[PDB]
């Protein structure tokens, strides 16, 4: 499933955003 591939690292990047402000 690629696309599940690909909401895997969206959380990544998100849980990044929240953690820096």
Known sequence: GVSELLISTAVQG?????LGA
């Open 14 to 18: 998100i849980l990044f955003a929240l």
